[PDB]
Amino acid sequence: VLSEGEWQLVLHVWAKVEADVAGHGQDILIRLFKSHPETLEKFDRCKHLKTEAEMKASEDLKKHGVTVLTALGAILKKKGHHEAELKPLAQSHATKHKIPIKYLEFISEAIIHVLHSRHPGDFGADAQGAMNKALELFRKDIAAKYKELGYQG
Ligand code: HEM
Ligand SMILES: */C(=C/C(=O)O)C(=O)Nc1cc2cccnc2c2ncccc12
Numbered sequence: 807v808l809s810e811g812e813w814q815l816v817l818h819v820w821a822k823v824e825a826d827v828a829g830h831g832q833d834i835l836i837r838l839f840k841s842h843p844e845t846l847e848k849f850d851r852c853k854h855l856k857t858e859a860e861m862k863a864s865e866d867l868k869k870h871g872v873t874v875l876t877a878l879g880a881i882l883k884k885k886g887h888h889e890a891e892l893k894p895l896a897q898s899h900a901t902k903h904k905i906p907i908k909y910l911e912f913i914s915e916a917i918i919h920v921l922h923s924r925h926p927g928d929f930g931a932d933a934q935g936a937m938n939k940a941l942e943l944f945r946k947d948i949a950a951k952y953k954e955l956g957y958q959g
């Protein structure tokens with residue numbers, strides 16, 4: 807459980823993401839793929855890491871980054887009351903895409919990295935810790951739903 811104050815720190819920095827969801831999404835996915843290139847294998851080959859400029863020019867990558875951050879922002883605004891939003895995400899990510907929790911840890915790391923790089927004034931230790939707790943709760947709850955669907959990843 808997060809405190810109300812911790813939720814507020816989470817949603818305060820999230821409002822900065824909402825000013826430009828696509829740009830944040832691009833930086834987060836580029837960080838993910840550079841730091842953990844194996845995560846490209848969950849998409850069509852082109853399993854090969856392209857240059858940063860090719861990733862920034864990609865209409866498909868920019869769309870993916872907005873798909874992710876739209877869904878995650880709706881989850882964070884529920885302040886832990888997110889069973890109904892996690893249900894369809896667990897369904898697809900466990901049964902169709904097959905995304906292991908360790909890849910959700912990787913993308914959580916990439917989100918925290920970009921938020922710290924772009925908004926340090928809104929992302930000191932207390933806010934970083936609140937965002938860490940919020941993303942740990944997301945991963946814990948999605949993992950329990952994965953198991954309910956028979957996926958142990
Ligand atoms: C914060 C974490 C994430 C969120 C909120 C998220 C959200 C979404 C949403 C909303 C969709 C579209 C609807 C659907 O298929 O469920 C989607 C599709 C997808 N996601 Fe995720 N995702 C996350 C993490 C990841 C990660 C880490 C990977 C891979 C390493 C991944 C792989 C996919 C794939 C392969 C698709 C299908 C894309 C396509 O067919 O074009 N997701 N995701
Ligand atoms: C590969 C690269 C290119 O520029 O031709 C390619 O099109 N394959 C591919 C990679 C990829 C990576 C991350 C997310 N989504 C994708 C793709 N999505 C749809 C079709 C192909 C994709």
Ligand SMILES: O=C(O)/C=C\C(=O)Nc1cc2cccnc2c2ncccc12
Binds near residue numbers: 853
């Ligand atoms: O565009 C597509 O049709 C498929 C994906 C893909 O990654 N192609 C590439 C394949 C490679 C193989 C070996 C080394 N480098 C690369 C490479 N380097 C940069 C950008 C793209 C690629």
